[PDB]
Design a protein around this nucleic acid. Structure first.
Ligand SMILES: [Mg+2]
Ligand SMILES: [Zn+2]
Ligand SMILES: [Zn+2]
Lengths: 99, 83, 82, 1343
RNA sequence: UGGCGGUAGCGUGC
DNA sequence: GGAAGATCGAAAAAAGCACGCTACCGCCCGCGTGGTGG
DNA sequence: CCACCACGCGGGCGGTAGCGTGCTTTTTTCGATCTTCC
């Protein structure tokens, strides 16, 4: 089984799972730890944000690859926004302080 | 056309700034439309940048100085054209 | 209210025996003069005055054109309470 | 964009500001028309339009109407994505408390109000009234009143007192309190109070109040009044076939809450009686609690098919929660999965990739190249061309993956080697081809294994894969430094077969001009591969200046060795290949090639070695046959004689000479000896029993048997495995653990009857079950270790610290487990190393110890080396490069910026599967080596016969060789007679000290007469007649049965002189009075003359594997802790209660504030008239790590933990460097409790991060103010991970509810400053290539 | 083509 | 000599239980109440 | 007058009660002594 791009989950905006659904392989916590041990920060960042969750990042990266430019925009994963909204729904105010 | 980066690693001496400088040089060739200082035997941009780093043609301070000189000639020329 | 079942005082029962005077307020108001929201047709999202309760299975509503309001019979479930 | 995350409880005004509307109806979606209802849970007006730039009514459906709200229906015309952010709010009829701040222990409301949680639950769920305004009556402020009590109170003084019921009363109480005045009163009470528990409670409440007042949060906000509502897309309605809609649990809970609120409002409007409205409010509170966190209190709300509903907090925490399912790990694009096969033609940097998988993965690159080439003018044309798969598409695919690395990863990624970068080579098929040499790194077998492949798709990722994660760069294991690229099965066998010599092989005795002639002879079938010839060869030696010098000489070798010599690089000598060249020899040759030549020739050498080994293994044609495993001819006789011995033992037992245990032990020993003899005979008959006719006569040589060939070379199998194949299987154990009397006397070549197979199945089943239940435990331990060291990176070069650990070789018993060389290799000394006896510097202060330095240290015979340690690193928020040491994966020193905690945790956790969880099943000192004897911590005295008896309970005997290096060490028990004195050389096998293990005989250091004093029969002693001798021996009666009159008459024997008074101890004014402990047996009668060293009185006297490692890393207190002497002083007994005694330590110069309760049944190693120092063992048992840290310091507990972990791992044969254990120990020691507040603002009982306390003390010292004294604490891995500055990591770890409640109450602000936080956020981690970026941001924050 | 629960199986010191 | 701090064991409550993948089955409220037709 | 279809509003299920029942570790609380004094 292989996948370049396809359908995404309607809640977390992540690629589906399983060969039947034409999903992508899951990069688990152990793989993240291995990447951190290797020190490949850029690979981990691109695999965490511009490949799975960042919708604008995904579209921009696809356009750049089609255009022949190998550059990315980290953006902001949608799962973190979902988590923030869920925690806010719990009565706890959590926000990102720019300062 | 490259299998080991040990010589490049010891040339840079940090094995982490080497990745950054090689990425900057590869982006300079691929996006900026630059030219390589060494012949390419049908080599990818990253491999070309690594090979350039191997012989000392490309270095972080060297790249910064070259970029600053290019910027200086660029806006000096634009100022001359405007005036 | 806890482990054991709650025991109401006899005063509460005695009061509730003769408390009930019949209550006018109801969750649904088919009374005339009550604004009612329409959710179908060009009248969707608009309020209309109630004319009077005529019939049992349905009641008539006073639809509101810009020119003037005119009564007409509608289905009871057709209109929504506002 | 942002720098930190702020978390606090939300005020009702803020909640209202968040919401764009109010939800008033439980309706979600009309079934007839798929449109949401007004004011519903999915209302378009409140949240947003269901379609992009389309009004719900349909008046405006174009982008030209963006930003204008329709007047017909009131829904804004904007994108549908805004429905993922807009939230709602529900106005509760009555306030309801938050379940998180009420039930999660400790209760925030109860702690703030200083009232029991049961009262809080009673008032909350409408069971008892609570006073609010006490007034001038006898009622206080917060008093619990029941229904009848409240009725009576309102009856008698029903004028001014206010008592309310429900959450409204709690909200009023919270709103009607002054934080500042209460904090001041609490501080004054804490200052005036003295109780330890009261002090701790007051300190906790003071800290809570200070944290609350410092932040902007208010207590009344802890009682919810407006309920937030999630955006609809976060709780979507899945459209099912047939018109049905899948409803999430959140929608059901929201509908229940809305219905309950509406019912309560309607009943309040109707003016229902008190009980009805109270029940409605209680039910609303229960529904709100179920929605917030279902199952916390009462019966959980069940689902459609009897399952608990998934509440808001249910999907946040746990393995299936958001943190561990969509933040730490996530599914990614450009990924594939396939089975893995073996490709022998591939190189170390190449892996096979199927054409279809490569085409699918690299689709965007092919599209871009096709567009660039002009073949396709649009994306649709490129997609169609790729689908049709023309030749041009294949050419483009081949072009785009010329040097594009791909990350190949296996499912059980135990360590960083589980994922590696490879260059793809196009193949046809559906299976990925893997390089054999990396298989050992992947722990992958070709028996159905499946592996995943990811495609890096940016320049930075491609270069990181090429330079960091490439297989050619990973040749040394970071765990221990041992090489990972080693031949395993076939290459080793081929090399062993090629490099072997026969006796009369064809072509023997020839003279060859070079390896080329040898190969041309072998290929032509004119000379055997094992023929012994002489060849003239030239070898290149590395010169001192770095050049290569060629020496030509004639060497006597074999044809195979000469053939193999050519593939060897120039620098290597010829001696490496002039042997049998087993697996160990091949690994040594590869290591030598890497050390001498470097890395670039090493990969080529490994590839050539693998190719040659595979080719010659194929040419050899080694095979396994039923005749290869030979059964010894002497097995039958050994079995018969063992059976005869067993039968004679059985008949002797039946005659009654011996018992069941003795005969069982004899049978076990006899069968073990028989099995050992059978195995020895098998090995003798297999290894060398072959005979060969040389040129003239017959002789013997090494066997060419295939089984022995693969067993001796190390390709596969082992001695025990060959023994099981050909010799007897040996004894087997039942599942309980005991051994079975009758062993399996049948070979695997021969048949095994039913009984033997049934017996043998027990061990296999036990091992399989152990592995199955061990995998999960190992994974959990690895995850905990990874978290506990997830935020440790190298952020400095040197601290200038003059501290470190004094590493010495470890010795246990009569052997040396680990020499000092490997322990100290790859580390930097903490101070100058001096030559023993010369006071001359050997190693500079800050020089890394490489191989040459270790060789100098070992040639100079140095055992104790002080080296800088990670646990002693002075750098805060990370460690320095110097204090860490060597990288252990690269030759040079450790780099700066990379993560070391993750590497250490992975290295420790990878061998977890090797350990086993299930637990199953002296009177003299023996000397094994010839050398001098040294006694440490020895206070010895000569006995009557001149022998030496030690009066110290911590005496060590060290056997030291003639070179001054400590060879062996033992702990000699107190009061052991010494056969020989100190400083006398002894030979092996000699006994130096002897002692009685069964009983401890009291030793006297004075000479005189023993008298019967201060002890009376029937009260404190008993004159019991001996069972056999009949002598009236005195036995000391314990205080339990001691008479009341004789309680103060403590028994004590005094040595007297001719005068008759007690003899003073030499050098001590206090007279020699040996106190008699309980159950003391004295045989000597009254007035018995004894000398020094005589025996006075007799006193009568675990887990391993994964559980032991977990207990060590969790700082679990042993269930039988050993009491230690906290303060140095004399020992005394003040008084005694029932079941306990009051041991008192009185320092000679210090005060006496200590009174230790010692349990009665705990044996006391020390007596009444002894002297002890700090950190001295008082009772038998394991030492608690907390006690070691508190008394003996950080270094002692660090060494203890390191030694225990290393011993546990060495028991299983796994070697791990001590750097990882030291890193974990340092991560454990991160909190400190203040002792004196000083000029700092830290509380006396506060527990603060060590770095913060150190920084504050440094600042105060710089400013001249006094510092604050601190005591470090030791916490478990989970405890340390939970108690950290960054609440995000603790919340993501486990127990998310408690961590989130703490963060919300305290109003903590969290900076990323770590790996897990940046991973969750989605930014570059501060470790590795991103580190140089992050530091830039820091300096950007500088200005 | 969206998910939960149950069941069974695969790869995980030979 | 009765009240407050100690403690002490015993009981009760909360949280955790490796990583990837594949296939099948079942379910995605439901029940009273009004509408309407035969 | 009876049976099938649509529509809205509660909630453990079903019953003239009871349903459970093979883990370990850590944290909190409580009755009961105790014990120590002012
Ligand atoms: Mg396998
Ligand atoms: Zn509209
Ligand atoms: Zn340091």
């Amino acid at each position: 089984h292989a996948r370049s791009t396809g359908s995404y989950s309607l809640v977390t905006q992540q690629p589906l799972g399983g060969k039947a659904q034409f999903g992508g392989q899951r990069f688990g916590e152990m793989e993240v730890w291995a990447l951190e041990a290797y020190g490949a920060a850029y690979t981990l960042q691109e695999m965490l944000t511009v490949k799975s969750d960042d919708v604008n990042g995904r579209t921009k990266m696809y356009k750049n690859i089609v255009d022949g430019n190998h550059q990315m925009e980290p953006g902001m994963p949608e799962s973190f926004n979902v988590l923030l909204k869920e925690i806010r729904s719990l009565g706890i105010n959590i926000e990102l302080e720019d300062e | 056309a490259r299998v080991t980066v040990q010589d490049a690693v010891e040339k840079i001496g940090n094995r982490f700034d080497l990745v950054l400088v090689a990425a900057r040089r590869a982006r300079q060739m691929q996006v900026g439309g630059k030219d390589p200082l060494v012949p390419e035997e049908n080599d990818k941009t990253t491999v070309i940048a690594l090979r350039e780093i191997e012989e000392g043609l490309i270095n972080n301070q060297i790249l910064d100085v070259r970029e600053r000189q290019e910027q200086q000639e660029q806006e000096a020329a634009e100022l001359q054209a405007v005036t | 209210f806890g482990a054991s079942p709650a025991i109401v005082p006899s005063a509460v029962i005695h009061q509730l025996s003769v408390y009930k005077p019949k209550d006018i307020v109801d969750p649904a108001t088919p009374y005339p003069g009550d604004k009612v929201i329409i959710t179908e047709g060009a009248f969707e999202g608009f309020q209309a005055i109630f004319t009077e309760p005529d019939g049992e299975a349905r009641s008539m509503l006073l639809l509101n054109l810009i020119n003037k309001e005119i009564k007409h019979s509608v289905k009871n479930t057709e209109f929504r309470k506002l | 964009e942002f720098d930190a995350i702020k978390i606090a409880l939300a005020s009702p005004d803020m909640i209202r500001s968040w919401s764009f509307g109010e939800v008033k109806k439980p309706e979600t979606i009309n079934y007839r028309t798929f449109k949401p209802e007004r004011d519903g849970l999915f209302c378009a007006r409140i949240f947003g339009p269901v379609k992009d730039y389309e009004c719900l009514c349909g008046k405006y459906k174009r982008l030209k109407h963006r930003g204008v709200i329709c007047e017909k229906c009131g829904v804004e015309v904007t994108q549908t994505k805004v429905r993922r952010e807009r939230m709602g709010h529900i106005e509760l009829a009555s306030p309801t408390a938050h379940i998180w701040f009420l039930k999660s222990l400790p209760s925030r409301i109860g702690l703030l109000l200083d009232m029991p949680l049961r009262d809080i639950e009673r008032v909350l769920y409408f069971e008892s009234y609570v006073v609010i305004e006490g007034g001038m009556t006898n009622l206080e402020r917060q008093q619990i009143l029941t229904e009848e009590q409240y009725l009576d109170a309102l009856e008698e003084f029903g004028d001014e007192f206010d008592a309310k019921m429900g959450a409204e009363a709690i909200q009023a109480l919270l709103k009607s309190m002054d934080l500042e005045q209460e904090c001041e009163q609490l501080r004054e009470e804490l200052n005036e109070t003295n109780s330890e528990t009261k002090r701790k409670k007051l300190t906790k409440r003071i800290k809570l109040l200070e944290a609350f007042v410092q932040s902007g949060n208010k207590p009344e906000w802890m009682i919810l009044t407006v309920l937030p509502v999630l955006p609809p897309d976060l709780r979507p309605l899945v459209p099912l076939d047939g018109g049905r809609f899948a409803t999430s649990d959140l929608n059901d809970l929201y509908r229940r809450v809305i219905n309950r609120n509406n019912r309560l409002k309607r009943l309040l409007d109707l003016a229902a009686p008190d009980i009805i409205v109270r029940n409605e409010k209680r039910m609303l509170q229960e529904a709100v609690d179920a929605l917030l966190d279902n199952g916390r209190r009462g019966r959980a709300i069940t689902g459609s098919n009897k399952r608990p509903l998934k509440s808001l907090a249910d999907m946040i925490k746990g393995k299936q929660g958001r943190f561990r399912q969509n933040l730490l790990g996530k599914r990614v694009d450009y990924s594939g999965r396939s089975v893995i096969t073996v490709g022998p033609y591939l190189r170390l940097h190449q892996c096979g990739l199927p054409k279809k998988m490569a085409l699918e993965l690299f689709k965007p690159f092919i599209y871009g190249k096709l567009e660039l080439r002009g073949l396709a003018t649009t994306i649709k044309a490129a997609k169609k061309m790729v689908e049709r798969e023309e030749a041009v598409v294949w050419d483009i695919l081949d072009e785009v993956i010329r040097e594009h690395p791909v990350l190949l990863n296996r499912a059980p990624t135990l360590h960083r080697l589980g994922i590696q970068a490879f260059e793809p080579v196009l193949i046809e098929g559906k299976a990925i081809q893997l390089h054999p040499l990396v298989c050992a790194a992947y722990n992958a077998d070709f028996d159905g294994d499946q592996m995943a492949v990811h495609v890096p798709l940016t320049l930075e990722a491609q270069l990181e894969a090429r330079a960091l994660m490439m297989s050619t760069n990973n040749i040394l294991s970071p765990a221990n430094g041992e090489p990972i690229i080693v031949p395993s099965q076939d290459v080793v066998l081929g090399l062993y077969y090629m490099t072997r010599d026969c006796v009369n092989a064809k072509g023997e005795g020839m003279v060859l001009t070079g390896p080329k002639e040898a190969e041309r002879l072998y290929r032509s079938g004119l000379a055997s591969l094992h023929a012994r010839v002489k060849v003239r060869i030239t070898e290149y030696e590395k010169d001192a200046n770095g050049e290569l010098v060629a020496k030509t000489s004639l060497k006597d070798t074999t044809v195979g060795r000469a053939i193999l010599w050519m593939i060897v690089p120039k620098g290597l000598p010829y001696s490496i290949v002039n042997q049998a060249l087993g697996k160990k020899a091949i690994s040594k040759m590869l290591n030598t090639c890497y050390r001498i030549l470097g890395l670039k020739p090493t990969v080529i050498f490994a590839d050539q070695i693998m190719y040659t080994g595979f080719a010659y293994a194929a040419r050899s044609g080694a095979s396994v046959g039923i005749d290869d495993m030979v059964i010894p001819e002497k097995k039958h006789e050994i079995i018969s004689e063992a059976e005869a011995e067993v039968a004679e033992i059985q008949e002797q037992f039946q005659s009654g000479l011996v018992t069941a245990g003795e005969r069982y032990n004899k049978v076990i020993d006899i069968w073990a000896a028989a099995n050992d003899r059978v195995s020895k005979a098998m090995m003798d008959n297999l290894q060398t029993e072959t005979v060969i006719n040389r040129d003239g006569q017959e002789e013997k040589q090494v066997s060419f048997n295939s089984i022995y060939m693969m067993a001796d070379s190390g390709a596969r199998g082992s001695a025990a495995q060959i023994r099981q194949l050909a010799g007897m299987r040996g004894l087997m154990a039942k599942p309980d653990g005991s051994i079975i009397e009758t062993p399996i006397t049948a070979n695997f070549r021969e048949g095994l009857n039913v009984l033997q197979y049934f017996i043998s199945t027990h061990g296999a089943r036990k091992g399989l079950a152990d592995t199955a239940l061990k995998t999960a435990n190992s994974g959990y331990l690895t995850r905990r270790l990874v978290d506990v060291a997830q935020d440790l990176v190298v952020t400095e070069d040197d601290c200038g610290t003059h501290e470190g650990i004094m590493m010495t070789p470890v010795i246990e018993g009569g052997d040396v487990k680990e020499p000092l060389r490997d322990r100290v290799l790859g580390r930097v000394t903490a101070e100058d190393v001096l030559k023993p006896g010369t006071a001359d510097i050997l190693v500079p202060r800050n020089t890394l110890l490489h191989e040459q330095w270790c060789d100098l240290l070992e040639e100079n015979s140095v055992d104790a080396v002080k080296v800088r340690s990670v646990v002693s690193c002075d750098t805060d928020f990370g460690v320095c490069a110097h204090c860490y040491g060597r990288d252990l994966a690269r030759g040079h020193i450790i780099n700066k910026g990379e993560a070391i905690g993750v590497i250490a945790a992975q290295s420790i956790g990878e061998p977890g599967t090797q350990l086993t969880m299930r637990t199953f099943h002296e009177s003299s000192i023996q000397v094994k080596n010839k050398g001098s004897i040294k006694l440490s911590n020895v206070k010895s005295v000569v006995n009557s016969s001149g022998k030496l008896v030690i009066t110290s309970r911590n005496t060590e005997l060290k056997l030291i060789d003639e070179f001054g290096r400590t060879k062996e060490s033992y702990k000699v028990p107190y009061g052991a007679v010494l056969a020989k004195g100190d400083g006398e050389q002894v030979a092996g096998g000699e006994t130096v000290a002897n002692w009685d293990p069964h009983t401890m005989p009291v030793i006297t250091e004075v000479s005189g007469f023993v008298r019967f004093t201060d002890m009376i029969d029937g009260q404190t002693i008993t004159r019991q007649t001996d069972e056999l001798t009949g002598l009236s021996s005195l036995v000391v009666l314990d205080s339990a049965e001691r008479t009341a009159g004789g309680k103060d008459l403590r028994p004590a024997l005094k040595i007297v002189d001719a005068q008759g008074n007690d003899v003073l101890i030499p050098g001590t004014d206090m007279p020699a009075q040996y106190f008699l402990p309980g159950k003391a047996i004295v045989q000597l009668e009254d007035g018995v003359q004894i000398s020094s060293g005589d025996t006075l009185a007799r006193i009568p006297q675990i887990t391993g594997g994964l559980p032991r490692v977990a207990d060590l890393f969790e700082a679990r207190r042993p269930k039988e802790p050993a009491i230690l002497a906290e303060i140095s002083g004399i020992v005394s007994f003040g008084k005694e209660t029932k079941g306990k005694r009051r041991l008192v330590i009185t320092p000679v110069d210090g005060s006496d504030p200590y009174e230790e309760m010692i349990p009665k049944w705990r044996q006391l190693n020390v007596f009444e008239g002894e002297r002890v120092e700090r950190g001295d063992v008082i009772s038998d048992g394991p030492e608690a790590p907390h006690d070691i840290l508190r008394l003996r310091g950080v270094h002692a507990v660090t060494r203890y933990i390191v030694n225990e972990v290393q011993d546990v791992y060495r028991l299983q044969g796994v070697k791990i460097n001590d750097k990882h254990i030291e890193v974990i120990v340092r991560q454990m020691l991160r909190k400190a409790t203040i002792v004196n507040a000083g000029s700092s603002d830290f509380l006396e009982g506060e527990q603060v991060e060590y770095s913060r306390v150190k920084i504050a003390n440094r600042e105060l010292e710089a400013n001249g103010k006094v510092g604050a004294t601190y005591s470090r604490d030791l916490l478990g891995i989970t405890k340390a991970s939970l108690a950290t500055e960054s609440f995000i990591s603790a919340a993501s770890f486990q127990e998310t509810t408690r961590v989130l409640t703490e963060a919300a109450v305290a109003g903590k602000r969290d900076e990323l400053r770590g790996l897990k936080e940046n991973v969750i956020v989605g930014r570059l981690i501060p470790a590795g290539t991103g580190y140089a970026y992050h530091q830039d941001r820091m300096r950007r924050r500088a200005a």
